[PDB]
Amino acid sequence: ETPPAGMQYLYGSGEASALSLQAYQALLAHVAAKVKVRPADSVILAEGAGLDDPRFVPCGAKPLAAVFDVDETVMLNIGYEYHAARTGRFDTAAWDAWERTGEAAVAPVPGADRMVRALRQMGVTVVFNTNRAAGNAEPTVRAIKAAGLGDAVHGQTLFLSGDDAMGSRKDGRRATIAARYCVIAMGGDQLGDFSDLFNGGPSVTARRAATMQPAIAQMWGNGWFVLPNPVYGSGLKGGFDEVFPLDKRWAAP
Amino acid sequence: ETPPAGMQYLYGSGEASALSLQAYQALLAHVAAKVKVRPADSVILAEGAGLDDPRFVPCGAKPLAAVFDVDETVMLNIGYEYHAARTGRFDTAAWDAWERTGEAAVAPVPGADRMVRALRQMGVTVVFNTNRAAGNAEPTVRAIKAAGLGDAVHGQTLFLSGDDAMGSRKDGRRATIAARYCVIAMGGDQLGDFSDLFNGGPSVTARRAATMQPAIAQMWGNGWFVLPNPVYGSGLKGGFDEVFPLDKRWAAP
Ligand SMILES: [Mg+2]
Ligand SMILES: [Mg+2]
């Protein structure tokens, strides 16, 4: 029995490991450049801004920070995905149990513990913005600690689903973070970890086109830093016609 | 019917698109830094060098170049993977037909056509090192052209499996390239696209550990640039015990 190809890739391969280390190398160099030369804009979009003409919450004199998604961005949910592979199960009740009892089965995303330590040695505050539930803040704090990612504090450096009434939408929390910090880098494994504009409607092919809108494309590896996730979530959608465009079809002999 | 999760991710998602654009943004900035300040070492390992103490073919006065894997690094093999998803088939005869007849069903990896044009505008020679077969050089040249990747020439900027007697091992071709160019960046989707030392023996867990050997880890996003591939190849290996380590297991209630 072998696990699903996506988990073999994400959890088992050196390919995925190298991909993640590249992401954090680029982030560390970017942060270091902006620690020496503070920017005028943060990397968080302003309220009402669109992807075509992005405007950003200004950096100002606010303390420097970096924002991170938690799950499959800085922390691997190994125990949970093991159970999903064993069971074949989108199990919301199981995920709730996992938020409460998974602190002993998490690992850092390759390079994320070293990157988080370097950021703090540079004087940059490490802020987590995750859709784990607010009522599970304390076990989530302990899991973050167990992955070697340091100390997170609910409401100061850790923001969770249910901290506002926006549900899985993260823009509201992003606005709260950007109102007190100059956010000079932002990491995630899902497009919703950078803007809610990618979700809540857009099709699979529309979301992929939107990442190549030039004013948005310039962010990738240059303020917005992406970690791989072919195991669950927004990337795992679309029928044959959205995945394989009709001008690129072919059949073997 | 939906395609395999890995193909939904790689071919359909904006997540994979953003991940690829980040890789090429980091590569472009790296190349530009080295065009201004030529390095002493290339990014290609010297003969007999090990991953723990890497030595590199020197840059010297040789003309500047960047080396790229072709398949799923700069070119998406959309037609072929469509057929694999339709058919469920590791089909070596089908892949041979595809090398010969697939030029009309390929697309650039997101950002790869723009990156290849920028490299040439910077005066950097774009060299391809692929395990497509030497006897299919001409259709491979045409497919590279159709993906918007420019003009490749067998034996000058394009090196193929069978150009030497080493089979799928790419070190021999890497040595030939590094003997005439100063290779300042190298891109790939498989660890064999950077060194043969990752393959031919090492286990799934050994290969992943090897990417974090510190002298090697420093390469990722800093000379060695990685593109995602959870669809086929070296990343899709390993049983449950290699993918989900035994100190990170968990079971739902
Ligand atoms: Mg996540
Ligand atoms: Mg390849």
PDB file of C-alpha atoms in Angstrom, chain A:
ATOM      1  CA  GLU A   1       0.000   0.000   0.000  1.00  0.00           C
ATOM      2  CA  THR A   2       1.418   3.375  -0.891  1.00  0.00           C
ATOM      3  CA  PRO A   3       0.083   6.761   0.277  1.00  0.00           C
ATOM      4  CA  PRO A   4      -1.552   9.131  -2.241  1.00  0.00           C
ATOM      5  CA  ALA A   5       0.907  10.513  -4.795  1.00  0.00           C
ATOM      6  CA  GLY A   6       0.425  14.037  -3.446  1.00  0.00           C
ATOM      7  CA  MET A   7       1.432  13.006   0.065  1.00  0.00           C
ATOM      8  CA  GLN A   8       4.381  10.934  -1.185  1.00  0.00           C
ATOM      9  CA  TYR A   9       5.453  14.167  -2.851  1.00  0.00           C
ATOM     10  CA  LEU A  10       4.761  16.690  -0.068  1.00  0.00           C
ATOM     11  CA  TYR A  11       5.740  14.629   2.990  1.00  0.00           C
ATOM     12  CA  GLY A  12       8.263  12.153   1.571  1.00  0.00           C
ATOM     13  CA  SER A  13      10.241  13.696  -1.308  1.00  0.00           C
ATOM     14  CA  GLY A  14      13.461  15.691  -1.393  1.00  0.00           C
ATOM     15  CA  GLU A  15      11.879  17.543  -4.325  1.00  0.00           C
ATOM     16  CA  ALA A  16       9.259  19.077  -1.996  1.00  0.00           C
ATOM     17  CA  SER A  17      11.898  19.725   0.659  1.00  0.00           C
ATOM     18  CA  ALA A  18      14.131  21.644  -1.777  1.00  0.00           C
ATOM     19  CA  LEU A  19      11.105  23.588  -3.066  1.00  0.00           C
ATOM     20  CA  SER A  20      10.251  24.688   0.479  1.00  0.00           C
ATOM     21  CA  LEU A  21      13.841  25.649   1.333  1.00  0.00           C
ATOM     22  CA  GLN A  22      14.001  27.747  -1.849  1.00  0.00           C
ATOM     23  CA  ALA A  23      10.844  29.605  -0.778  1.00  0.00           C
ATOM     24  CA  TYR A  24      12.337  30.483   2.611  1.00  0.00           C
ATOM     25  CA  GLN A  25      15.748  31.410   1.210  1.00  0.00           C
ATOM     26  CA  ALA A  26      14.031  33.924  -1.080  1.00  0.00           C
ATOM     27  CA  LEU A  27      11.947  35.200   1.853  1.00  0.00           C
ATOM     28  CA  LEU A  28      14.981  35.617   4.125  1.00  0.00           C
ATOM     29  CA  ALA A  29      16.911  37.614   1.508  1.00  0.00           C
ATOM     30  CA  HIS A  30      13.838  39.748   0.795  1.00  0.00           C
ATOM     31  CA  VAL A  31      13.248  40.488   4.499  1.00  0.00           C
ATOM     32  CA  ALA A  32      16.938  41.308   5.020  1.00  0.00           C
ATOM     33  CA  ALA A  33      16.874  43.791   2.119  1.00  0.00           C
ATOM     34  CA  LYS A  34      13.854  45.528   3.636  1.00  0.00           C
ATOM     35  CA  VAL A  35      15.305  45.520   7.174  1.00  0.00           C
ATOM     36  CA  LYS A  36      18.224  47.545   5.777  1.00  0.00           C
ATOM     37  CA  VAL A  37      15.971  49.750   3.589  1.00  0.00           C
ATOM     38  CA  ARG A  38      12.477  50.042   5.059  1.00  0.00           C
ATOM     39  CA  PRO A  39       9.846  50.215   2.278  1.00  0.00           C
ATOM     40  CA  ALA A  40       6.965  52.626   1.918  1.00  0.00           C
ATOM     41  CA  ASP A  41       4.332  49.933   1.217  1.00  0.00           C
ATOM     42  CA  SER A  42       3.653  46.792   3.186  1.00  0.00           C
ATOM     43  CA  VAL A  43       2.849  43.559   1.322  1.00  0.00           C
ATOM     44  CA  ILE A  44      -0.784  43.511   2.562  1.00  0.00           C
ATOM     45  CA  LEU A  45      -3.410  44.869   0.154  1.00  0.00           C
ATOM     46  CA  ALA A  46      -5.384  47.919   1.197  1.00  0.00           C
ATOM     47  CA  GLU A  47      -9.129  47.715   1.778  1.00  0.00           C
ATOM     48  CA  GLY A  48     -11.029  47.724  -1.482  1.00  0.00           C
ATOM     49  CA  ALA A  49      -7.910  47.281  -3.582  1.00  0.00           C
ATOM     50  CA  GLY A  50      -8.097  45.078  -6.656  1.00  0.00           C
ATOM     51  CA  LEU A  51      -5.532  42.647  -8.086  1.00  0.00           C
ATOM     52  CA  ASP A  52      -5.152  44.652 -11.324  1.00  0.00           C
ATOM     53  CA  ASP A  53      -4.251  47.914  -9.518  1.00  0.00           C
ATOM     54  CA  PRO A  54      -3.022  46.777  -6.102  1.00  0.00           C
ATOM     55  CA  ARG A  55      -2.598  49.334  -3.371  1.00  0.00           C
ATOM     56  CA  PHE A  56      -1.057  48.344  -0.063  1.00  0.00           C
ATOM     57  CA  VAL A  57      -1.398  49.347   3.566  1.00  0.00           C
ATOM     58  CA  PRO A  58       1.578  51.715   4.003  1.00  0.00           C
ATOM     59  CA  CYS A  59       4.561  50.614   6.040  1.00  0.00           C
ATOM     60  CA  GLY A  60       4.897  53.923   7.911  1.00  0.00           C
ATOM     61  CA  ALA A  61       6.887  53.799  11.141  1.00  0.00           C
ATOM     62  CA  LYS A  62       5.211  50.578  12.311  1.00  0.00           C
ATOM     63  CA  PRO A  63       7.318  47.705  13.710  1.00  0.00           C
ATOM     64  CA  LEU A  64       8.530  45.253  11.066  1.00  0.00           C
ATOM     65  CA  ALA A  65       6.737  41.913  10.781  1.00  0.00           C
ATOM     66  CA  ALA A  66       6.258  38.853   8.574  1.00  0.00           C
ATOM     67  CA  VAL A  67       2.883  37.083   8.316  1.00  0.00           C
ATOM     68  CA  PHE A  68       2.585  33.308   7.961  1.00  0.00           C
ATOM     69  CA  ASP A  69      -0.190  30.890   7.278  1.00  0.00           C
ATOM     70  CA  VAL A  70       0.266  27.983   9.666  1.00  0.00           C
ATOM     71  CA  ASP A  71      -0.908  24.694   8.149  1.00  0.00           C
ATOM     72  CA  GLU A  72       1.375  23.408   5.337  1.00  0.00           C
ATOM     73  CA  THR A  73       3.155  26.796   5.278  1.00  0.00           C
ATOM     74  CA  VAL A  74       5.286  26.668   8.453  1.00  0.00           C
ATOM     75  CA  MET A  75       3.874  23.467  10.053  1.00  0.00           C
ATOM     76  CA  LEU A  76       3.327  20.039   8.473  1.00  0.00           C
ATOM     77  CA  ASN A  77       0.179  18.310   9.760  1.00  0.00           C
ATOM     78  CA  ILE A  78       1.754  14.892   9.458  1.00  0.00           C
ATOM     79  CA  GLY A  79      -0.413  13.008  11.948  1.00  0.00           C
ATOM     80  CA  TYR A  80      -3.618  14.302  10.402  1.00  0.00           C
ATOM     81  CA  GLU A  81      -2.629  13.503   6.821  1.00  0.00           C
ATOM     82  CA  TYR A  82      -1.453  10.057   7.918  1.00  0.00           C
ATOM     83  CA  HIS A  83      -4.953   9.451   9.214  1.00  0.00           C
ATOM     84  CA  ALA A  84      -6.507  10.827   6.023  1.00  0.00           C
ATOM     85  CA  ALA A  85      -4.312   8.525   3.913  1.00  0.00           C
ATOM     86  CA  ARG A  86      -5.155   5.516   6.091  1.00  0.00           C
ATOM     87  CA  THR A  87      -8.853   6.331   6.027  1.00  0.00           C
ATOM     88  CA  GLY A  88      -9.372   7.868   2.574  1.00  0.00           C
ATOM     89  CA  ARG A  89     -11.394  10.714   4.155  1.00  0.00           C
ATOM     90  CA  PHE A  90     -12.849  16.088   4.087  1.00  0.00           C
ATOM     91  CA  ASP A  91     -13.536  15.062   7.697  1.00  0.00           C
ATOM     92  CA  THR A  92     -14.458  18.231   9.597  1.00  0.00           C
ATOM     93  CA  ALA A  93     -15.042  16.457  12.930  1.00  0.00           C
ATOM     94  CA  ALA A  94     -11.652  14.724  12.638  1.00  0.00           C
ATOM     95  CA  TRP A  95      -9.937  18.017  11.878  1.00  0.00           C
ATOM     96  CA  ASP A  96     -11.506  19.540  14.985  1.00  0.00           C
ATOM     97  CA  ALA A  97     -10.131  16.682  17.112  1.00  0.00           C
ATOM     98  CA  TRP A  98      -6.782  17.212  15.385  1.00  0.00           C
ATOM     99  CA  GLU A  99      -6.646  20.908  16.281  1.00  0.00           C
ATOM    100  CA  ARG A 100      -7.143  19.809  19.869  1.00  0.00           C
ATOM    101  CA  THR A 101      -4.862  16.754  20.071  1.00  0.00           C
ATOM    102  CA  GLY A 102      -2.288  16.962  17.245  1.00  0.00           C
ATOM    103  CA  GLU A 103       0.557  18.857  18.929  1.00  0.00           C
ATOM    104  CA  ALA A 104       2.608  15.626  19.155  1.00  0.00           C
ATOM    105  CA  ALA A 105       2.445  14.819  15.428  1.00  0.00           C
ATOM    106  CA  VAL A 106       3.555  18.028  13.688  1.00  0.00           C
ATOM    107  CA  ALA A 107       6.891  18.931  12.090  1.00  0.00           C
ATOM    108  CA  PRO A 108       8.241  22.171  10.620  1.00  0.00           C
ATOM    109  CA  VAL A 109       7.959  22.788   6.919  1.00  0.00           C
ATOM    110  CA  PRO A 110      11.574  22.329   5.730  1.00  0.00           C
ATOM    111  CA  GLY A 111      13.461  25.513   6.516  1.00  0.00           C
ATOM    112  CA  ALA A 112      10.648  27.142   8.515  1.00  0.00           C
ATOM    113  CA  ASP A 113      12.169  26.749  11.994  1.00  0.00           C
ATOM    114  CA  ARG A 114      15.515  28.174  10.832  1.00  0.00           C
ATOM    115  CA  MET A 115      13.742  30.990   8.954  1.00  0.00           C
ATOM    116  CA  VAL A 116      11.614  31.936  11.948  1.00  0.00           C
ATOM    117  CA  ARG A 117      14.704  32.058  14.182  1.00  0.00           C
ATOM    118  CA  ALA A 118      16.600  34.228  11.683  1.00  0.00           C
ATOM    119  CA  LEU A 119      13.643  36.621  11.414  1.00  0.00           C
ATOM    120  CA  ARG A 120      13.612  37.133  15.174  1.00  0.00           C
ATOM    121  CA  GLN A 121      17.391  37.607  15.260  1.00  0.00           C
ATOM    122  CA  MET A 122      16.826  40.317  12.606  1.00  0.00           C
ATOM    123  CA  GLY A 123      14.289  42.101  14.845  1.00  0.00           C
ATOM    124  CA  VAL A 124      11.259  41.102  12.709  1.00  0.00           C
ATOM    125  CA  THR A 125       8.090  40.044  14.530  1.00  0.00           C
ATOM    126  CA  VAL A 126       6.715  36.677  13.375  1.00  0.00           C
ATOM    127  CA  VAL A 127       2.892  36.806  13.064  1.00  0.00           C
ATOM    128  CA  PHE A 128       0.678  33.776  12.319  1.00  0.00           C
ATOM    129  CA  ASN A 129      -2.686  34.118  10.533  1.00  0.00           C
ATOM    130  CA  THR A 130      -4.356  30.683  10.366  1.00  0.00           C
ATOM    131  CA  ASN A 131      -7.832  29.256   9.898  1.00  0.00           C
ATOM    132  CA  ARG A 132      -7.450  26.953  12.869  1.00  0.00           C
ATOM    133  CA  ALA A 133     -10.246  27.832  15.267  1.00  0.00           C
ATOM    134  CA  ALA A 134     -10.019  30.516  17.942  1.00  0.00           C
ATOM    135  CA  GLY A 135     -11.317  28.123  20.596  1.00  0.00           C
ATOM    136  CA  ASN A 136      -8.300  25.858  19.928  1.00  0.00           C
ATOM    137  CA  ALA A 137      -5.732  28.654  20.347  1.00  0.00           C
ATOM    138  CA  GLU A 138      -3.863  27.037  23.258  1.00  0.00           C
ATOM    139  CA  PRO A 139      -3.239  23.611  21.631  1.00  0.00           C
ATOM    140  CA  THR A 140      -2.360  25.474  18.424  1.00  0.00           C
ATOM    141  CA  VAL A 141       0.191  27.562  20.366  1.00  0.00           C
ATOM    142  CA  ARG A 142       1.684  24.337  21.763  1.00  0.00           C
ATOM    143  CA  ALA A 143       1.811  22.704  18.303  1.00  0.00           C
ATOM    144  CA  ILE A 144       3.570  25.755  16.841  1.00  0.00           C
ATOM    145  CA  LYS A 145       6.056  25.482  19.729  1.00  0.00           C
ATOM    146  CA  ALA A 146       6.538  21.746  19.116  1.00  0.00           C
ATOM    147  CA  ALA A 147       7.330  22.342  15.435  1.00  0.00           C
ATOM    148  CA  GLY A 148      10.229  24.536  16.568  1.00  0.00           C
ATOM    149  CA  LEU A 149       8.488  27.717  15.401  1.00  0.00           C
ATOM    150  CA  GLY A 150       8.744  29.687  18.666  1.00  0.00           C
ATOM    151  CA  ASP A 151       6.169  31.370  20.880  1.00  0.00           C
ATOM    152  CA  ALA A 152       2.868  32.608  19.460  1.00  0.00           C
ATOM    153  CA  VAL A 153       0.372  34.707  21.435  1.00  0.00           C
ATOM    154  CA  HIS A 154      -3.348  34.817  20.621  1.00  0.00           C
ATOM    155  CA  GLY A 155      -4.256  38.366  19.605  1.00  0.00           C
ATOM    156  CA  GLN A 156      -0.656  39.667  19.275  1.00  0.00           C
ATOM    157  CA  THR A 157       1.211  37.233  16.983  1.00  0.00           C
ATOM    158  CA  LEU A 158      -1.524  34.635  16.378  1.00  0.00           C
ATOM    159  CA  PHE A 159      -4.857  35.261  14.658  1.00  0.00           C
ATOM    160  CA  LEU A 160      -7.414  32.528  14.147  1.00  0.00           C
ATOM    161  CA  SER A 161     -10.679  31.739  12.444  1.00  0.00           C
ATOM    162  CA  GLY A 162     -13.426  33.142  14.631  1.00  0.00           C
ATOM    163  CA  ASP A 163     -11.316  36.041  15.894  1.00  0.00           C
ATOM    164  CA  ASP A 164     -13.749  38.050  13.729  1.00  0.00           C
ATOM    165  CA  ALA A 165     -17.100  37.174  12.121  1.00  0.00           C
ATOM    166  CA  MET A 166     -15.603  36.687   8.610  1.00  0.00           C
ATOM    167  CA  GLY A 167     -15.268  32.881   8.743  1.00  0.00           C
ATOM    168  CA  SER A 168     -12.491  31.469   6.563  1.00  0.00           C
ATOM    169  CA  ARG A 169     -11.914  34.871   4.956  1.00  0.00           C
ATOM    170  CA  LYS A 170      -8.577  36.219   6.136  1.00  0.00           C
ATOM    171  CA  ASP A 171      -8.704  39.816   4.811  1.00  0.00           C
ATOM    172  CA  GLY A 172     -10.154  41.104   8.088  1.00  0.00           C
ATOM    173  CA  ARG A 173      -7.317  39.644  10.136  1.00  0.00           C
ATOM    174  CA  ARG A 174      -4.787  40.848   7.539  1.00  0.00           C
ATOM    175  CA  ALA A 175      -6.163  44.377   8.029  1.00  0.00           C
ATOM    176  CA  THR A 176      -5.811  44.087  11.804  1.00  0.00           C
ATOM    177  CA  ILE A 177      -2.194  42.928  11.462  1.00  0.00           C
ATOM    178  CA  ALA A 178      -1.316  45.612   8.914  1.00  0.00           C
ATOM    179  CA  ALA A 179      -2.832  48.310  11.138  1.00  0.00           C
ATOM    180  CA  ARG A 180      -0.143  47.692  13.754  1.00  0.00           C
ATOM    181  CA  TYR A 181       2.798  46.238  11.809  1.00  0.00           C
ATOM    182  CA  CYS A 182       4.806  46.997   8.723  1.00  0.00           C
ATOM    183  CA  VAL A 183       4.405  43.592   7.064  1.00  0.00           C
ATOM    184  CA  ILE A 184       7.410  43.131   4.774  1.00  0.00           C
ATOM    185  CA  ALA A 185       6.799  39.476   3.824  1.00  0.00           C
ATOM    186  CA  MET A 186       3.863  37.071   3.762  1.00  0.00           C
ATOM    187  CA  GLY A 187       3.970  33.293   3.348  1.00  0.00           C
ATOM    188  CA  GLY A 188       1.287  30.775   2.502  1.00  0.00           C
ATOM    189  CA  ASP A 189       0.330  27.571   0.717  1.00  0.00           C
ATOM    190  CA  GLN A 190      -3.110  28.752  -0.538  1.00  0.00           C
ATOM    191  CA  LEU A 191      -4.083  31.853  -2.513  1.00  0.00           C
ATOM    192  CA  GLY A 192      -6.458  32.844   0.283  1.00  0.00           C
ATOM    193  CA  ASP A 193      -3.338  33.317   2.403  1.00  0.00           C
ATOM    194  CA  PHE A 194      -2.570  36.447   0.343  1.00  0.00           C
ATOM    195  CA  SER A 195      -5.970  37.836  -0.605  1.00  0.00           C
ATOM    196  CA  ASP A 196      -9.601  36.739  -0.238  1.00  0.00           C
ATOM    197  CA  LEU A 197     -10.104  38.047  -3.769  1.00  0.00           C
ATOM    198  CA  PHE A 198      -8.837  34.716  -5.125  1.00  0.00           C
ATOM    199  CA  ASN A 199     -11.731  32.785  -3.484  1.00  0.00           C
ATOM    200  CA  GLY A 200     -15.466  33.001  -2.845  1.00  0.00           C
ATOM    201  CA  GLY A 201     -16.433  32.642  -6.502  1.00  0.00           C
ATOM    202  CA  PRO A 202     -13.553  32.581  -9.006  1.00  0.00           C
ATOM    203  CA  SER A 203     -13.251  29.430 -11.103  1.00  0.00           C
ATOM    204  CA  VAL A 204     -10.172  27.195 -11.193  1.00  0.00           C
ATOM    205  CA  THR A 205      -8.994  28.739 -14.466  1.00  0.00           C
ATOM    206  CA  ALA A 206      -9.815  32.304 -13.358  1.00  0.00           C
ATOM    207  CA  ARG A 207      -7.764  31.929 -10.164  1.00  0.00           C
ATOM    208  CA  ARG A 208      -4.743  30.673 -12.119  1.00  0.00           C
ATOM    209  CA  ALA A 209      -5.001  33.527 -14.625  1.00  0.00           C
ATOM    210  CA  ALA A 210      -5.231  35.985 -11.722  1.00  0.00           C
ATOM    211  CA  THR A 211      -1.810  34.941 -10.387  1.00  0.00           C
ATOM    212  CA  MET A 212      -0.366  36.167 -13.701  1.00  0.00           C
ATOM    213  CA  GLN A 213      -2.004  39.593 -13.649  1.00  0.00           C
ATOM    214  CA  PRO A 214       1.324  41.482 -13.929  1.00  0.00           C
ATOM    215  CA  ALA A 215       0.896  43.751 -10.894  1.00  0.00           C
ATOM    216  CA  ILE A 216       0.168  40.590  -8.889  1.00  0.00           C
ATOM    217  CA  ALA A 217       2.725  38.355 -10.621  1.00  0.00           C
ATOM    218  CA  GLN A 218       5.495  40.698  -9.440  1.00  0.00           C
ATOM    219  CA  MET A 219       4.678  39.730  -5.813  1.00  0.00           C
ATOM    220  CA  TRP A 220       5.625  36.049  -6.049  1.00  0.00           C
ATOM    221  CA  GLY A 221       9.013  35.443  -4.454  1.00  0.00           C
ATOM    222  CA  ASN A 222       9.149  39.203  -3.964  1.00  0.00           C
ATOM    223  CA  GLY A 223       6.903  39.860  -0.957  1.00  0.00           C
ATOM    224  CA  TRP A 224       4.451  36.949  -1.269  1.00  0.00           C
ATOM    225  CA  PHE A 225       6.094  33.578  -0.674  1.00  0.00           C
ATOM    226  CA  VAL A 226       4.487  30.299  -1.634  1.00  0.00           C
ATOM    227  CA  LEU A 227       4.813  26.825  -0.165  1.00  0.00           C
ATOM    228  CA  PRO A 228       3.567  23.681  -1.985  1.00  0.00           C
ATOM    229  CA  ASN A 229       0.353  21.832  -1.159  1.00  0.00           C
ATOM    230  CA  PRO A 230      -0.891  19.181  -3.606  1.00  0.00           C
ATOM    231  CA  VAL A 231      -2.585  17.295  -0.748  1.00  0.00           C
ATOM    232  CA  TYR A 232      -5.785  19.266   0.045  1.00  0.00           C
ATOM    233  CA  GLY A 233      -7.459  22.618  -0.521  1.00  0.00           C
ATOM    234  CA  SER A 234      -7.943  25.166  -3.290  1.00  0.00           C
ATOM    235  CA  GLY A 235      -5.400  23.585  -5.610  1.00  0.00           C
ATOM    236  CA  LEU A 236      -7.295  20.291  -5.825  1.00  0.00           C
ATOM    237  CA  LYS A 237     -10.219  21.365  -7.997  1.00  0.00           C
ATOM    238  CA  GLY A 238     -11.405  21.343 -11.550  1.00  0.00           C
ATOM    239  CA  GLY A 239     -12.640  18.903 -14.160  1.00  0.00           C
ATOM    240  CA  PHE A 240     -10.751  17.671 -17.179  1.00  0.00           C
ATOM    241  CA  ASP A 241     -11.570  20.737 -19.313  1.00  0.00           C
ATOM    242  CA  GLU A 242     -10.254  23.177 -16.718  1.00  0.00           C
ATOM    243  CA  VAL A 243      -7.120  21.172 -15.963  1.00  0.00           C
ATOM    244  CA  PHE A 244      -6.197  20.244 -19.565  1.00  0.00           C
ATOM    245  CA  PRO A 245      -7.085  23.128 -21.933  1.00  0.00           C
ATOM    246  CA  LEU A 246      -8.678  22.095 -25.197  1.00  0.00           C
ATOM    247  CA  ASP A 247      -5.927  23.506 -27.414  1.00  0.00           C
ATOM    248  CA  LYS A 248      -3.350  21.184 -25.767  1.00  0.00           C
ATOM    249  CA  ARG A 249      -5.038  17.760 -26.091  1.00  0.00           C
ATOM    250  CA  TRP A 250      -3.325  14.637 -27.459  1.00  0.00           C
ATOM    251  CA  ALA A 251      -3.855  10.867 -27.710  1.00  0.00           C
ATOM    252  CA  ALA A 252      -1.306   8.047 -27.848  1.00  0.00           C
ATOM    253  CA  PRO A 253      -1.100   5.801 -31.000  1.00  0.00           C
TER     254      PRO A 253
END
